[model samples]
Target: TGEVGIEAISMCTGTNRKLVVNQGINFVEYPSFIPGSTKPGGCVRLPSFSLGLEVFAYAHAITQDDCTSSSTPDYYFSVGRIADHGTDVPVFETLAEWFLDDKMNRRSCSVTAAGKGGWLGCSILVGSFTDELTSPEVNRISLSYMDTFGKKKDWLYTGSEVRADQSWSALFFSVGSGVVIGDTVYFLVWGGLNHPINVDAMCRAPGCQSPTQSLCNYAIKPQEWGGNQIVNGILHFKHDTNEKPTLHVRTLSPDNNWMGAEGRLFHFHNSGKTFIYTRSSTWHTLPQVGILTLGWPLSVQWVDITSISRPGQSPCEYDNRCPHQCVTGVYTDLFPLGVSYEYSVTAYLDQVQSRMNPKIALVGAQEKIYEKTITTNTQHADYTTTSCFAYKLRVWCVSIVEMSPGVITTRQPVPFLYHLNLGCQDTSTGSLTPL
Candidate 1:
């Protein structure tokens, strides 16, 4: 199952990633950044009841342009959480402060995916005041922000051990999230400090100089690290945010009793996402009995259903319709045969259910067919005729089940096909004709 509740965060600075600052006595000024433009001071409104906020700090230093220096220039900073800000005796507490070091040239550090506890209001204080450390020294810092559930941290940062030198561009830095077993951080590092190192070698801990078996334990994946084929592009899995629909077929065969075919349909929607249900239908008896159609707004994706009265049709029917566009039966000796198929429906949203397209036509279609023959002569039985048939649905992506709006963690839906029955045989008469 997936985790419940909403996860979000607010940040300073825009996509540009640079925030300008001029610090004074317990006060700092950054005319414009994030949450508000031309906003002064270090405070930014945080979402109420957030499990915790993950903040990334980057200090601009000339040494970063080239890895000639041992470490980055140290800059002290503090983040304070405010509960009540109405009077002189306001309620607030210092949540975090930057760690000091003798050779503190580390350019970046962020709250790990295992985030800090809850904080309502967030304020910042740069260690240097207007009268201290080159007063009014307009410095820039890159802050990446995120919020997670109370316990689980949804973000992570690669420590300073991994360094990208002059060859790397900060613009190439990419951060994305994916779910392998649970939520994970996808951090990509590009380029090299002194000279380009082996892309795989960089995937280890501080100075390990060897490749780590696991990809993300170092919390860093090599991206665009020159000629290496393995380290290209951002290292994140493809994220498909649509709900998956469920399908099933079930039946029981009896000795000369009424044969039945039954099916079940459901849909799976992941949590912490948005979805809407347009329309859906149960069954249709036209063209064929018990045919089902499910329609979600957007596209006129169709699955054409056509079957031959018998296998041996003419050349035009055989060549044009027999092989490429038909559902064939599967023959077997087992009384209750079981088979299943899966597919991925990629419907283009722009073309589906568009206001301009007035007609209901096959904009896109996917069809799968299953067939077989069955025959057996019974020994000394009252009936002796045998026949066979099976059921499969060529359901369109749009023509599927009704999906509920909410989050789902486990049993997510994927493309699926269900075989309805094996085959039916008659024991009353000893006839060898196929049905």
Candidate 2:
């Protein structure tokens, strides 16, 4: 007599605070509910057949002290069906088996399906970070599990880690353990956390649904661009399996045009599916929804513009200071296909600062390090002809920004296209040159 009904409530903490689960029903809260008028029929349903859960725990840096002091704390999770009023025992002891930096990215778990009849499995998705920066931090994550009640448990993170970058999943088989016919086994599980220094900024899922979408929405204050509005920033997430279901996320209620908002209207849709009435597609997902990520303070660079226009330079206006001896040079790289420009002039000085303690910028493009300099030879008077020289380095057009687990990180073909927004100039004058 094989029955199906597993469920549990897992808790986690790190720089951020959140709980994870798979399926869940609204519980009685503090304020009390409305009497007979409403029978509370509005419960959410999630689509994943099986349960998987993962959480990221690591320090901001290997050499730094505990960065958990400023961590945000909260709770949330979901549970599937279980025997009526029965305690659920987890099938495994650990969900992850690897760790890096001793604890910076270290992970360990107790295998629950040692020899049980139940089956359990686990996996992890380590983000491809530049390591270009010295310190790295933990961010967003997902975890899955199944308990005695046959419920699929999903532990999504909604902490202040800013990014739940790492993920772990596992399936376990119950070994030689005996079970009672009506006794409920308890699955007591705990999700862990950590705070890293150099945390990579992640793009949140757009047009989020109410509570679920809020995980990434309020978690990371993403910079909006292109068609993204604070009220209706669209988020797209692709699901596994041949169906290749692309989930489009958005906030509806009082329509906003960007991130940084608590919108009421939340809609999730599939772009490729057919629309019957007002609903978009037959590919309706999101069986259960909960906030795993929340208001975590993350600083990202949207763009670094050295000049007003990137097409060309503006005419120089000398105020009787000195002649402009401008030096223009462009260097291009063939391997990654990138370009750089060196624009330094013995003319007017551009007083802009780039030395503000390396922060993350989310410019519309994946370009880095654009700078220009001007020097003057005159003792009393300054060189007035020095035009602004900007450095723009664009990565190879077809770069794979993100990929799912089990995917090789080798030379894979680019699967998506990047979009660009209009450039804005901040006070630095310079000539433009193509490398």
Candidate 3:
């Protein structure tokens, strides 16, 4: 079964204050129930993924669960080093040199994911970095910001180093992994800070969701483009099987559009189908986090206590002395959380269809015989009537923009088209089919 997510409450604030997020994270003061008080709480969620990174509020909190019965000052509540047990546990290496000089003020942690031959693996970081101003054979270098206090925050950063901001503010300080794809290794960068050093300045330049709100420098975009006032953002994830269903995700409550993945709403369609209710199809690049790539944090309806869990169970979950040997490297290779500027969805109205004869279907094969192309913002298109019943209405369009000459990176595209599914009203009853 596919798992959604999880929420854990610290019975007592133990000791270690360090946060090395792996799968997803939602850290708060133990046993508190304030609505918007929690921070550094999100994941790099894809269509169907589980959650079980790690959270360590108190450094020495888990000695009792130690399998070897050896008392070591290992931070975090989970098994510190399970590698000796056989399984290659996720590693979080914070170099002492990063803090050899200063822990706060001028220094920040930088993070990036790397592996050979277009492979993106777990994120590696420099507990100290100065944004792209500088890792290991990294095809690309990136940083996840971690603040002075382990209360991690995320802001806009484009450098490769995973370092956080200066002043105050907030990961390898990454939350969940991200979804970025390509052959060329990119040093994609973003600020993972509680406080930001640079933000909002370029937001007004172009493509910003908020051009007027200059200081609204949130690096992680929201699921919805609107504010916390109403439930606006939307997400559609696919199922593996052809008849498998798609699901929707949103904030748990009204107007809580913060970027943290804590208490967000994730629901499957009751009708067992996913549809585009909005007029336009909008998409963005998944920002990089702990693993590789990532989305926006939106606030919606109300807040509730939520938790996350994944598919299987470990025979030695809390026992570090024993091995949790299992599948390795399969996740990053097969279902990598990747990034791309353009995403084309070839969806269909599976349940809804026309009762017309087979001749209509043959006519749709010729495309020109069934209907003419409904001109949409045309750049260069290769349209086709691909559907169970292509005789129905078809719509196509395109949009192209060239970022000014002098920008960090120029933007451009070649070709693609949007497929519109139209349902008509019945002349007999003047009632439309299920829309």
Candidate 1, which segments miss by more than 4 Å at Cα?
A: 1-71, 75-94, 104-113, 117-226, 229-435
| Cα distance off (Å), candidate 3, residue 422 | 14
Q: What lDDT does candidate 3 reach at residue 318? A: 14
| Model 2 alpha-carbon miss at residue 360, Å | 41
What ranges in model 3 sit over 4 Å off?
1-191, 198-211, 214-343, 346-435
**Local error of candidate 2 at 89, Å?**
23
Global CA lDDT of candidate 3, please? 0.18
Task: Give me the candidate number with maximum TM-score.
Answer: 1
Cα displacement (angstroms), candidate 3, residue 58, comes to 30
Give candidate 1's error at residue 350 in angstroms: 29
Query: Candidate 1, 246: how far from true, in Å?
Result: 36
Displacement of the residue 142 alpha carbon in candidate 1, Å: 18
- TM value for model 1: 0.20
Per-residue error at 49 for model 3, in Å?
7.8
Candidate lDDT (C-alpha), each: 0.19, 0.18, 0.18
What is the clash count for each candidate, in the order shown?
27, 110, 67
Residue range 325-396, candidate 2, lDDT tens digits: 111110010110111111111111222111111111111112322322211222111101110111122111
